[PDB]
Amino acid sequence: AIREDTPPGSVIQYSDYELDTSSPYAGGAAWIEGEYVPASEARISIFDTGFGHSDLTYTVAHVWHGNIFRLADHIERLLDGARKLRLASPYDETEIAEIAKRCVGLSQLREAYVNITLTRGYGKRKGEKDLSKLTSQIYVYAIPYLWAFPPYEQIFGTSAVVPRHVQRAGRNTIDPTIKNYQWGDLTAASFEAKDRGARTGILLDADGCVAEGPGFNVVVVKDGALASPSRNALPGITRKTVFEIAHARGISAELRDVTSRELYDADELMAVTTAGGVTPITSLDGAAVGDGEPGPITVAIRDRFWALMDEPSDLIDTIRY
Amino acid sequence: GAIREDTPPGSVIQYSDYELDTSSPYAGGAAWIEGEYVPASEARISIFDTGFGHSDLTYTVAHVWHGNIFRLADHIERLLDGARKLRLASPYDETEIAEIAKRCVGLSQLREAYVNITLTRGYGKRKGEKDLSKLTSQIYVYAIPYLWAFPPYEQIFGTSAVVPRHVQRAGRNTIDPTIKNYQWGDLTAASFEAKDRGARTGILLDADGCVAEGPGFNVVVVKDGALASPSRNALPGITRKTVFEIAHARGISAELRDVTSRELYDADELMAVTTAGGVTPITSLDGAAVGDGEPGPITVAIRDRFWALMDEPSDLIDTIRYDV
């Protein structure tokens, strides 16, 4: 399915277009080992140490209405993280962008989820343990748009818990600031949230400050100001965008430690991520956040984020199909 | 591939000499994926398996020496116990998994081999579905030429380690070390730090400052003729289990407990235990000799008897039928 239901008045509306049924790449495109191939066919060698050791970094960029959003920023973030991992990219920035945009083209999707993965790769002999012998492998795929939170929740908000049983991985153990596939703590959080009947969980770090959720940054709105955790959390591109919008409106937006107490005391809570953008979190721990309905500042920031996808700018590049 | 490698001449570690029959494609590497056996060089999985995207998986590794696979049932029991902890459900049963693992070793034709069984959350027909129930779990098994966490000459003569200043092992409440996982971020950072310091490995610490499993290996500390190994934040190693059993048969006292870092420095002998290569002395820590700087008596005894264990008939060993 290349589209799914969204609220009628909503700022979020899918684009009307019919997939060609002739092209194999239509509706799913991936690029593996120097070849573009249909997503249904994409496979990687079990012996890639990025699977065996999750020795990888990734980024995802979203395309809405034919436009890729902040793709240059995402690739810059991917390469900064790889350098921290002493992981070396086979391709340069431009080359990676080139592959990504072609992928969306052959995918033929106005709305799509695009993943770029850089892994330590494999050497000649299976299971090799030497960094010297491995050569990094890049994997890129474009698939129908994916929602961290359902679109109806994007308009009307979502429910969350602070998980008691799991905490976010520390900066010195598995750095959350490098986007990674090592989701053990995050998956644990989601299981705890659904046992508690919430849709998600906001995790805390070792000192007890707010960290992030599974797949999203958390932004806390109080006294007409925005705060988001500065440590034990990814530097999300969606978060940077939300802060940019807030500064344009003249609202104070800061990255700092955020106490759990603040989380409970907040006027508005939002979850921000590349897949689905800006989500109101209307309830925390079974209790209403403020009114119980999406906060006005959250509403403003979300509505302008979706607007940004359509207005022409440096941030959005038009995919050519 | 190379079925063998050089081993020290006096050493208890000697490869079995045979030659691979080059006719078969499976010879030298066998794998089982999506319901069919395939040559290892051909083994691949869908990018969309959530075992990659989220590393939502558990695994175990068994070693084959001189034609016999070692404690394979214990390994499969541990894998599925962890899977139950992860709310991960296996498609195939205990017997079925053992059946596939041993067939992989047979078609491999390796009398010395590395066998991996991996259980993953898998992939829904929809690409990247977040719904747990919509996904269907996958079992992947592969048998490949033997791999050494430490080189055999290092098994006989010892190895070097540091405790990293910059990295800690993931805690029980973040990514459970007690479940075998591919989430090696902390472990990889540790190996990098040891290389920069010029040691071959690193012994990690937990949040309280107690010893934690070194990457790909449990740590055993010998002091005053007794064995201690970390009880919290270390995988329950089968090699460690065996090392403890041998210690009991020899009348050496062995306990699973918290080990303070100072204890690590104060030790008489240090050993590293894992399935891939067994028992390794750690002669030097942080660039200083551990005692004599030579493999410890207790360590040597348990190492030699471990390898001997591979050859004596027992319930621990099952003979692989390479006929196929």
XYZ file of C-alpha atoms in Angstrom:
645
model
C 0.000 0.000 0.000
C 1.560 3.272 -1.112
C -0.824 5.353 1.027
C -3.130 4.870 4.005
C -5.771 6.862 5.855
C -5.095 10.402 7.210
C -7.626 12.827 8.814
C -9.498 14.936 6.226
C -8.826 18.417 7.579
C -5.327 17.320 8.637
C -2.194 19.074 7.429
C -1.002 15.536 6.586
C -2.394 14.420 3.268
C -1.022 11.759 0.971
C -0.372 12.557 -2.697
C -2.637 11.061 -5.419
C -0.626 9.056 -8.001
C -0.888 5.558 -9.490
C 2.152 3.238 -9.348
C 3.182 1.885 -12.770
C 2.753 -1.911 -12.601
C 5.249 -2.471 -15.383
C 8.447 -1.460 -13.625
C 9.733 -4.030 -11.107
C 11.286 -1.303 -8.919
C 7.917 0.414 -8.617
C 6.847 0.616 -4.974
C 10.101 -0.635 -3.507
C 13.656 0.199 -4.496
C 16.919 -0.865 -2.872
C 20.570 -0.623 -3.796
C 22.980 -3.332 -2.676
C 26.638 -3.930 -3.548
C 26.724 -1.691 -6.632
C 23.345 -2.750 -8.057
C 19.828 -1.261 -7.882
C 17.209 -4.019 -7.326
C 13.566 -4.338 -6.215
C 13.100 -4.060 -2.465
C 11.425 -7.478 -2.355
C 14.777 -8.843 -3.577
C 17.150 -6.927 -1.247
C 19.402 -9.165 0.838
C 22.746 -8.874 2.631
C 25.355 -11.487 3.467
C 24.801 -13.036 6.880
C 28.563 -12.610 7.404
C 28.480 -8.772 7.313
C 29.872 -7.681 10.680
C 27.193 -4.979 10.731
C 24.757 -7.785 11.428
C 26.970 -9.919 13.638
C 28.264 -7.018 15.746
C 25.650 -4.394 14.767
C 28.792 -2.512 13.725
C 26.967 0.161 11.717
C 25.485 3.678 11.535
C 22.353 4.656 9.668
C 20.176 7.586 8.848
C 16.682 7.846 7.392
C 15.232 10.730 5.400
C 11.563 11.063 4.485
C 10.068 12.193 1.183
C 6.678 13.902 1.236
C 4.834 14.988 -1.930
C 7.766 14.143 -4.141
C 10.327 16.076 -2.073
C 13.235 14.748 -0.007
C 13.680 16.660 3.251
C 17.078 17.828 4.507
C 18.925 14.956 2.800
C 22.279 16.731 2.842
C 22.011 17.187 6.623
C 21.219 13.496 7.113
C 24.228 12.349 5.105
C 26.455 14.752 7.000
C 25.180 13.263 10.274
C 25.765 9.732 9.018
C 29.384 10.491 8.119
C 30.113 12.317 11.393
C 28.872 9.216 13.286
C 30.901 6.856 11.068
C 34.078 8.866 11.796
C 33.369 8.447 15.544
C 33.027 4.690 14.800
C 36.291 4.794 12.788
C 34.071 3.412 10.063
C 35.172 4.542 6.611
C 32.635 5.162 3.843
C 33.121 3.565 0.402
C 31.397 6.555 -1.250
C 31.464 10.319 -0.747
C 28.514 12.471 0.372
C 27.465 13.438 -3.172
C 27.629 9.820 -4.312
C 25.440 8.649 -1.422
C 22.878 11.369 -2.132
C 22.932 10.362 -5.801
C 22.072 6.772 -4.944
C 19.360 7.790 -2.509
C 17.541 10.032 -4.969
C 17.752 7.527 -7.775
C 16.311 4.964 -5.358
C 13.264 7.082 -4.699
C 12.937 7.651 -8.423
C 12.772 3.958 -9.263
C 10.574 3.410 -6.232
C 8.097 5.864 -7.841
C 6.799 6.942 -4.389
C 5.679 10.559 -3.672
C 5.623 9.580 0.051
C 8.495 7.330 1.112
C 10.891 6.201 3.845
C 14.555 6.192 2.764
C 17.272 4.406 4.734
C 21.026 4.746 4.285
C 23.119 2.226 6.197
C 26.888 2.110 6.500
C 28.301 -1.122 7.940
C 31.802 -2.334 8.682
C 31.238 -5.014 6.042
C 33.054 -8.310 5.436
C 36.570 -9.434 4.523
C 37.655 -12.420 2.439
C 37.240 -15.210 5.047
C 33.945 -15.638 6.909
C 33.664 -14.220 10.441
C 36.978 -12.352 10.117
C 37.979 -10.347 13.238
C 40.395 -7.854 11.729
C 39.357 -4.304 10.939
C 42.020 -4.212 8.217
C 40.467 -7.005 6.152
C 36.890 -5.744 6.292
C 35.772 -3.222 3.683
C 32.723 -1.058 4.512
C 29.444 -1.833 2.658
C 26.682 0.811 2.086
C 23.018 -0.214 1.747
C 20.306 2.209 0.573
C 16.587 1.521 0.317
C 13.385 3.481 -0.397
C 10.028 2.014 0.663
C 6.427 3.221 1.288
C 6.195 5.856 4.029
C 6.439 4.478 7.596
C 4.838 6.034 10.680
C 6.508 5.942 14.081
C 3.055 7.027 15.276
C -0.166 6.599 13.288
C -1.288 9.667 11.323
C -4.442 10.031 13.394
C -2.248 10.117 16.469
C -0.095 12.753 14.749
C -3.158 14.982 14.576
C -4.787 14.082 17.930
C -1.850 12.937 20.066
C -0.525 9.723 21.595
C -0.043 8.103 25.010
C 3.247 7.420 26.784
C 4.828 5.979 29.925
C 8.129 6.384 31.683
C 9.345 2.764 31.830
C 10.336 1.519 35.264
C 12.120 -1.597 34.048
C 14.495 -0.236 31.400
C 16.712 2.811 31.081
C 18.402 4.314 28.023
C 21.874 3.120 27.061
C 24.525 5.443 28.393
C 26.825 7.602 26.346
C 29.834 5.489 27.389
C 28.282 2.103 26.635
C 26.460 2.358 23.291
C 26.401 5.991 22.302
C 22.803 7.059 21.593
C 24.259 10.115 19.827
C 25.354 7.781 17.026
C 22.288 6.473 15.266
C 22.440 2.690 15.591
C 20.463 -0.537 15.248
C 21.183 -1.741 18.825
C 17.657 -1.387 20.131
C 17.634 -3.817 23.063
C 16.715 -1.122 25.598
C 14.302 0.543 23.156
C 12.467 -2.713 22.354
C 12.238 -3.403 26.082
C 10.693 0.022 26.523
C 8.042 -0.676 23.912
C 7.115 -3.986 25.480
C 6.726 -2.259 28.843
C 4.610 0.481 27.304
C 2.171 -1.908 25.701
C 1.863 -3.953 28.893
C 0.979 -0.652 30.546
C -1.434 0.093 27.670
C 0.462 3.134 26.397
C 1.686 3.461 22.882
C 5.246 4.359 23.816
C 7.781 5.078 26.521
C 10.051 8.022 27.318
C 13.243 6.595 28.806
C 15.515 8.107 31.446
C 19.292 7.983 31.626
C 21.481 6.723 34.460
C 21.312 9.906 36.528
C 17.537 9.985 36.108
C 17.264 12.716 33.457
C 15.049 12.330 30.423
C 16.734 10.608 27.487
C 14.596 9.692 24.437
C 11.934 7.296 23.225
C 12.213 4.324 20.935
C 12.835 6.093 17.659
C 12.044 9.634 18.728
C 13.386 12.682 20.497
C 11.246 14.220 23.259
C 10.520 17.942 23.439
C 9.103 19.419 26.621
C 6.983 22.594 26.481
C 6.631 24.614 29.684
C 5.990 28.315 30.319
C 6.076 28.937 26.582
C 9.560 27.489 26.241
C 10.920 24.326 24.599
C 13.564 22.033 26.105
C 14.988 18.780 24.840
C 17.599 16.445 26.416
C 21.189 17.345 25.433
C 22.800 13.987 26.435
C 21.963 10.256 25.954
C 19.795 11.183 22.915
C 20.301 11.356 19.143
C 20.726 14.810 17.606
C 17.607 14.372 15.475
C 17.142 16.340 12.306
C 13.429 16.675 13.092
C 14.340 18.128 16.497
C 16.704 20.655 14.935
C 13.909 21.632 12.526
C 11.417 22.030 15.393
C 13.894 24.253 17.213
C 14.410 26.300 14.040
C 10.696 26.864 13.748
C 10.500 27.820 17.411
C 13.273 30.380 17.038
C 11.581 31.876 13.976
C 8.466 32.382 16.119
C 10.674 33.868 18.854
C 10.059 30.999 21.299
C 12.958 29.979 23.515
C 14.291 26.517 22.541
C 17.208 24.979 24.442
C 19.042 21.675 24.725
C 19.705 20.872 28.359
C 19.250 18.200 30.958
C 15.524 17.735 31.530
C 14.443 16.353 34.886
C 11.794 13.649 35.119
C 9.917 16.103 37.338
C 9.761 18.483 34.409
C 8.326 15.733 32.291
C 5.435 15.336 34.733
C 5.011 19.106 35.168
C 4.958 19.942 31.441
C 2.313 22.021 29.694
C 2.846 20.201 26.380
C 4.890 17.117 25.452
C 5.879 16.285 21.888
C 7.710 13.432 20.228
C 9.727 14.363 17.151
C 11.170 12.046 14.550
C 11.806 11.727 10.840
C 9.027 9.137 10.365
C 5.811 11.107 10.873
C 7.349 14.314 12.172
C 5.754 15.964 15.208
C 3.450 14.066 17.537
C 1.569 15.435 20.550
C 1.862 13.221 23.620
C -1.428 13.940 25.309
C -1.098 11.483 28.262
C 1.852 10.392 30.399
C 1.582 7.464 32.809
C -2.176 7.300 32.334
C -2.646 10.960 33.289
C -3.517 13.823 30.983
C -0.823 16.256 29.883
C -2.382 19.664 30.328
C -5.761 19.780 28.626
C -5.477 16.190 27.457
C -5.468 17.480 23.878
C -2.578 18.639 21.680
C -1.017 21.801 23.033
C -1.190 25.005 21.000
C 2.577 25.408 20.600
C 2.844 21.738 19.569
C 0.033 22.311 17.054
C 1.707 25.364 15.592
C 5.064 23.671 15.258
C 3.614 20.521 13.682
C 1.467 22.442 11.197
C 4.440 24.459 10.056
C 6.648 21.367 9.747
C 4.189 19.800 7.320
C 3.938 23.149 5.544
C 7.745 23.122 5.148
C 7.635 19.951 3.135
C 5.658 21.738 0.416
C 7.124 25.233 0.313
C 10.243 25.474 -1.935
C 13.520 25.875 -0.024
C 17.087 24.569 0.565
C 15.599 22.039 3.045
C 13.444 20.191 0.452
C 14.932 18.773 -2.804
C 12.486 17.619 -5.519
C 13.018 13.949 -6.463
C 12.780 13.425 -10.262
C 10.904 10.279 -11.403
C 38.925 -21.413 2.648
C 41.534 -22.831 5.049
C 40.286 -25.684 7.223
C 43.302 -25.309 9.538
C 45.970 -23.042 10.950
C 49.310 -23.526 12.680
C 49.134 -24.731 16.320
C 52.049 -25.103 18.776
C 53.777 -28.510 18.523
C 53.779 -29.528 22.181
C 50.282 -27.975 22.594
C 47.078 -29.883 23.414
C 45.525 -28.008 20.453
C 46.056 -29.825 17.172
C 43.847 -29.668 14.146
C 42.660 -32.878 12.626
C 44.317 -33.434 9.215
C 41.953 -34.537 6.452
C 41.177 -33.028 3.113
C 38.001 -31.494 1.805
C 36.346 -33.263 -1.097
C 36.115 -30.391 -3.583
C 33.183 -31.901 -5.460
C 30.475 -30.708 -3.091
C 29.465 -27.011 -3.050
C 28.774 -27.161 0.715
C 32.312 -28.342 1.405
C 34.029 -25.838 3.682
C 30.903 -23.823 4.519
C 27.287 -24.801 5.121
C 24.316 -22.664 6.107
C 20.586 -23.022 6.521
C 18.330 -20.080 5.596
C 14.590 -19.842 4.861
C 14.182 -23.607 4.929
C 17.038 -24.689 2.667
C 20.689 -25.602 3.147
C 23.037 -23.458 1.019
C 26.800 -22.944 0.697
C 28.085 -20.431 3.205
C 29.511 -18.052 0.577
C 25.930 -17.883 -0.773
C 24.236 -17.152 2.592
C 22.227 -13.900 2.773
C 19.179 -12.493 4.564
C 16.551 -9.889 3.816
C 17.616 -6.360 4.806
C 14.111 -6.012 6.274
C 14.583 -8.656 8.951
C 14.019 -6.759 12.184
C 16.947 -8.760 13.541
C 19.077 -6.361 11.534
C 17.149 -3.067 11.835
C 16.631 -3.465 15.581
C 19.112 -6.288 16.317
C 16.027 -8.000 17.796
C 17.663 -11.407 18.124
C 19.417 -13.950 20.311
C 22.208 -16.277 19.243
C 24.429 -19.091 20.438
C 27.711 -20.536 19.133
C 28.948 -24.156 19.400
C 32.402 -25.396 18.445
C 33.282 -28.621 16.644
C 36.687 -30.162 17.338
C 38.098 -33.407 15.914
C 34.683 -34.231 14.476
C 32.687 -33.902 17.721
C 30.327 -31.016 18.550
C 30.566 -29.808 22.164
C 27.577 -29.464 24.551
C 25.208 -28.608 21.713
C 22.028 -29.244 23.742
C 23.168 -26.894 26.504
C 23.690 -24.215 23.873
C 20.239 -24.706 22.336
C 18.617 -24.656 25.748
C 20.396 -21.388 26.548
C 19.352 -19.853 23.235
C 15.694 -20.640 23.761
C 15.756 -19.562 27.399
C 17.020 -16.183 26.294
C 14.450 -16.137 23.517
C 11.729 -16.613 26.091
C 13.150 -13.668 27.968
C 12.956 -11.595 24.780
C 9.353 -12.726 24.166
C 10.850 -14.173 20.985
C 9.299 -17.468 19.809
C 11.281 -19.980 17.768
C 9.730 -21.621 14.676
C 11.561 -24.906 15.267
C 11.971 -27.032 18.374
C 15.134 -28.035 20.311
C 15.603 -31.307 18.413
C 14.927 -29.626 15.072
C 17.555 -26.954 15.752
C 20.116 -29.608 16.742
C 19.221 -31.616 13.661
C 19.905 -28.618 11.399
C 23.108 -27.625 13.162
C 24.644 -31.076 12.805
C 23.603 -31.363 9.180
C 25.318 -28.043 8.542
C 28.506 -29.429 10.049
C 28.238 -32.586 7.957
C 27.906 -30.847 4.602
C 30.542 -28.437 5.722
C 32.914 -31.437 6.037
C 34.777 -29.579 8.834
C 36.168 -31.620 11.673
C 37.124 -28.284 13.254
C 34.294 -25.816 12.887
C 32.416 -22.776 14.203
C 28.628 -23.207 14.359
C 26.246 -20.309 14.887
C 22.522 -20.633 15.564
C 20.623 -17.332 15.384
C 16.994 -16.681 16.285
C 15.482 -13.388 15.111
C 12.190 -11.532 15.326
C 12.078 -11.633 11.550
C 10.029 -9.817 8.922
C 6.360 -9.127 8.154
C 5.209 -9.179 4.524
C 4.858 -5.361 4.883
C 8.325 -3.689 4.700
C 9.538 -2.517 8.167
C 6.256 -3.332 9.984
C 6.408 -2.284 13.693
C 3.763 -4.887 14.755
C 5.373 -7.752 16.710
C 2.612 -10.266 16.050
C 2.617 -9.636 12.261
C 6.290 -10.652 12.016
C 7.398 -14.288 11.880
C 10.635 -15.425 13.538
C 13.601 -16.737 11.583
C 16.246 -19.340 12.469
C 19.576 -19.098 10.656
C 22.276 -21.733 11.168
C 25.765 -21.787 9.762
C 28.892 -23.973 10.073
C 32.232 -22.513 8.931
C 35.980 -23.110 9.478
C 37.056 -22.736 13.089
C 37.497 -19.192 14.423
C 39.787 -18.141 17.253
C 38.895 -15.321 19.617
C 42.597 -15.516 20.418
C 45.267 -17.144 18.223
C 46.359 -20.663 19.254
C 49.884 -19.611 20.137
C 48.222 -17.102 22.465
C 46.097 -19.880 23.997
C 49.290 -21.677 24.914
C 51.467 -18.762 25.868
C 48.987 -16.124 27.081
C 47.587 -12.798 25.951
C 47.507 -9.105 26.896
C 44.613 -7.005 28.174
C 43.645 -3.570 29.481
C 40.622 -2.299 31.368
C 39.220 0.556 29.218
C 38.998 4.062 30.660
C 36.393 5.162 28.141
C 33.894 2.295 27.888
C 31.696 0.288 30.278
C 29.695 -2.833 29.641
C 25.992 -2.362 29.067
C 23.980 -2.948 32.236
C 21.245 -5.466 33.003
C 18.572 -2.701 32.724
C 19.763 -1.383 29.331
C 20.934 -4.241 27.064
C 21.020 -7.455 29.052
C 24.498 -9.023 28.811
C 22.964 -12.241 30.097
C 21.258 -12.689 26.740
C 23.572 -13.396 23.852
C 23.083 -10.547 21.403
C 24.824 -8.899 18.416
C 24.765 -5.484 20.092
C 28.546 -5.081 20.418
C 28.879 -1.279 20.480
C 30.499 -1.210 23.912
C 32.523 -4.339 23.112
C 33.789 -2.915 19.827
C 34.737 0.365 21.457
C 36.699 -1.681 23.991
C 38.642 -3.594 21.349
C 39.519 -0.316 19.583
C 40.777 1.172 22.891
C 42.942 -1.919 23.598
C 44.463 -1.693 20.090
C 45.330 1.977 20.708
C 46.877 0.984 24.016
C 48.641 -1.945 22.199
C 46.967 -4.796 24.119
C 45.102 -7.525 22.358
C 41.822 -7.301 24.350
C 39.962 -5.449 27.064
C 38.250 -6.449 30.285
C 35.201 -4.234 30.796
C 33.629 -3.007 34.032
C 29.980 -2.456 34.971
C 28.408 0.673 36.482
C 29.354 -0.273 40.035
C 32.983 -0.856 39.035
C 32.822 -4.656 39.144
C 34.349 -6.837 36.416
C 32.120 -7.453 33.338
C 32.512 -9.881 30.405
C 35.396 -8.933 28.059
C 34.231 -8.748 24.384
C 33.511 -12.302 23.225
C 34.671 -13.861 26.547
C 33.912 -14.442 30.220
C 36.693 -13.541 32.677
C 37.900 -15.923 35.404
C 40.117 -14.725 38.222
C 42.399 -17.058 40.168
C 43.454 -15.960 43.653
C 44.768 -18.114 46.496
C 44.058 -21.247 44.485
C 40.400 -20.393 43.905
C 38.316 -19.307 40.926
C 35.950 -16.332 40.823
C 33.895 -15.225 37.867
C 31.450 -12.300 37.610
C 27.860 -13.205 38.573
C 26.180 -10.001 37.252
C 26.596 -8.408 33.753
C 28.288 -11.419 32.168
C 26.755 -13.939 29.842
C 26.318 -17.361 31.443
C 29.089 -19.000 29.468
C 29.012 -22.691 28.707
C 32.792 -22.619 28.540
C 32.736 -20.997 31.978
C 30.307 -23.686 33.134
C 32.755 -26.352 31.953
C 35.720 -24.570 33.518
C 33.856 -24.604 36.823
C 33.033 -28.301 36.446
C 36.687 -29.114 35.818
C 37.665 -27.016 38.822
C 35.289 -29.041 40.987
C 36.632 -32.352 39.692
C 40.148 -31.139 40.487
C 39.088 -29.910 43.900
C 39.680 -26.216 43.114
C 37.112 -23.962 44.762
C 35.026 -21.938 42.263
C 32.445 -19.218 42.929
C 30.275 -16.857 40.830
C 30.319 -13.499 42.548
C 30.994 -9.831 42.151
C 34.668 -9.154 41.471
C 36.017 -5.720 42.319
C 38.411 -4.099 39.886
C 41.150 -3.970 42.541
C 40.708 -7.737 42.752
C 41.444 -7.961 39.021
C 44.788 -6.230 39.572
C 45.566 -8.267 42.706
C 44.983 -11.668 41.026
C 47.426 -14.551 40.781
C 46.086 -15.816 37.435
C 43.699 -14.362 34.861
C 41.867 -16.474 32.298
C 39.504 -15.704 29.450
C 36.961 -18.390 28.564
C 34.809 -18.644 25.460
C 33.520 -21.339 23.096
C 35.700 -20.203 20.181
C 39.143 -21.305 21.370
C 38.354 -22.241 25.008
C 40.597 -21.178 27.937
C 43.219 -18.468 27.423
C 45.717 -17.168 29.968
C 45.949 -13.406 30.278
C 49.601 -12.855 31.121
C 49.570 -9.056 31.170
C 46.978 -6.495 32.218
C 47.457 -2.768 31.560
C 51.008 -3.457 30.391
C 52.119 -5.085 33.682
C 52.735 -8.774 34.205
C 49.947 -10.712 35.934
C 52.205 -12.354 38.539
C 54.998 -14.170 36.626
C 53.754 -12.852 33.243
C 53.547 -16.538 32.203
C 50.411 -18.826 31.998
C 49.214 -19.750 35.505
C 49.425 -23.377 36.831
C 45.688 -23.556 37.521
C 44.949 -22.036 34.110
C 47.240 -24.474 32.297
C 45.698 -27.450 34.051
C 42.106 -26.478 33.225
C 42.982 -25.560 29.631
C 44.688 -28.891 28.926
C 41.870 -30.835 30.499
C 39.283 -28.861 28.509
C 40.882 -29.844 25.224
C 41.203 -33.411 26.472
C 37.449 -33.231 27.104
C 36.897 -32.835 23.400
C 38.213 -36.365 22.723
C 36.884 -38.522 25.590
C 33.416 -39.942 24.926
C 30.807 -38.274 27.098
C 27.355 -36.757 27.039
C 29.147 -33.406 26.588
C 30.371 -34.415 23.090
C 28.252 -35.704 20.183
C 30.006 -37.218 17.172
C 28.929 -35.537 13.904
C 28.202 -37.975 11.049
C 30.104 -36.397 8.124
C 28.556 -39.023 5.825
C 25.890 -37.253 3.668
